[PDB]
From Swiss-Prot:
Keyword Iron-sulfur among UniProt keywords: no
GO terms assigned for molecular function: aspartic-type endopeptidase activity
Any single GO BP term: proteolysis
Keyword Disulfide bond: yes
Location of this fragment in the whole protein: 90 to 419 of 419
Record-annotated disulphide pairs: 255-290
Similarity comment text for this entry: Belongs to the peptidase A1 family.
Keyword terms, alphabetized: Aspartyl protease, Disulfide bond, Hydrolase, Protease, Signal, Zymogen
Record's protein name: Endothiapepsin
Reactions the enzyme catalyzes: Hydrolysis of proteins with specificity similar to that of pepsin A, prefers hydrophobic residues at P1 and P1', but does not cleave 14-Ala-|-Leu-15 in the B chain of insulin or Z-Glu-Tyr. Clots milk
Domain Peptidase A1 span(s) in chain numbering: 17-328
Organism of derivation: Cryphonectria parasitica (Chestnut blight fungus)
Length: 330
């Protein structure tokens, strides 16, 4: 089996992407944030504290003939941006782009933090990291990908995120028309539960590539590219007027500046992030100061290849016995 679904930016900055997911019988379609940096599938629901629901589409398990309450099970998650949610747990039929998993754990939010409430466009998350990170208690549950794996033509899914445009999540096959040149594959460590790998280095604009190991995770659920302070300083030093602002919380630059590209290494191959991808617009409405898309990971505790990086590539998440990541230009 396979599935193919279009993923769409939630706003003009590509702050996140949403993908339609069918839940229950008859189907209830919710727009979920596919997140390769977490492993919970959770949704706004009929159980969510009413005062914490503001425009989102909710899952109503009582209207689904296939919903089953997982007795006594609870979940609670915190994300790196300080967001959180929690609730109880159903299993139900879940389909993504034609691919159906029966008995998928669908985590129903009883509580969500304000950042989720205030974002009307995201109806929940669908985690695609390794199931070891799943927060259901007393017994951890499997991700959509884990459940689907054995049925898939090939045990893989791919992320093809768009720059200010829709893109695609495919399950079970590699679309050889979706990228240029070849895919370079690189080893993954699953020890922390993430799609963790080691980039082979970086370049700034037309500068010579610096060969250096950069451990990090491929995380579709993080907007920006977070890298060591040395690397990030080297990048912004090439942008006239750029500075790190503690007030704003990162590197800012004059909105009129020309941004250089940023290159990261995958084995002997290279992915080039165009300068335009690194512009996240005015720091506040009407400002001539713009917020940078490459920021320091210092304080996060891990480097994160988020959407700014991944949208410059066709990315294979290879879930074979020994997992790997593949990257191609496009």
């Amino acid at each position: 089996s396979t599935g193919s679904a279009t993923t769409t930016p939630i706003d003009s900055l590509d702050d996140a992407y949403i993908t339609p997911v069918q839940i229950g019988t008859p189907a209830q379609t919710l727009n979920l944030d596919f997140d390769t940096g977490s492993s919970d599938l959770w949704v706004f629901s009929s159980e969510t504290t009413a005062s914490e629901v503001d425009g989102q589409t909710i899952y109503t398990p009582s209207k689904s003939t296939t919903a089953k309450l997982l007795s006594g099970a609870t979940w609670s998650i915190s994300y790196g941006d300080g967001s959180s949610s929690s609730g109880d747990v159903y299993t139900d039929t879940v389909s993504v782009g034609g691919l159906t998993v029966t008995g998928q754990a669908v985590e129903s939010a009883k509580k969500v933090s304000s950042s989720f409430t205030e974002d009307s466009t995201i109806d929940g998350l669908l985690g695609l990291a390794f199931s070891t990170l799943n927060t259901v208690s007393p017994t951890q549950q499997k991700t959509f990908f884990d459940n689907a794996k054995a049925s898939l033509d090939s045990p893989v899914f791919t992320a093809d995120l768009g720059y200010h445009a829709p893109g695609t999540y495919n399950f079970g096959f590699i679309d050889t028309t979706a990228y240029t040149g070849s895919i370079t594959y690189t080893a993954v460590s699953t020890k922390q539960g993430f799609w963790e790998w080691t980039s082979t280095g970086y370049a700034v604009g037309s500068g010579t590539f610096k060969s250096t190991s950069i451990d990090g995770i491929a995380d579709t659920g993080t907007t920006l590219l977070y890298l060591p302070a040395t690397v990030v300083s080297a990048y912004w030093a090439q942008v006239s007027g750029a500075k790190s602002s503690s007030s704003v919380g990162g590197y800012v630059f004059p909105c009129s500046a020309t941004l250089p590209s940023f290159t990261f290494g995958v084995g002997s191959a290279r992915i080039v992030i165009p300068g335009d991808y690194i512009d996240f617009g005015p720091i506040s409405t009407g400002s001539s100061s713009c917020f940078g898309g490459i920021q320091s990971s210092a304080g996060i505790g891990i480097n994160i290849f988020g959407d700014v990086a991944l949208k410059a590539a066709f990315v294979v998440f290879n879930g074979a016995t020994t997992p790997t990541l593949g990257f191609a230009s496009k």
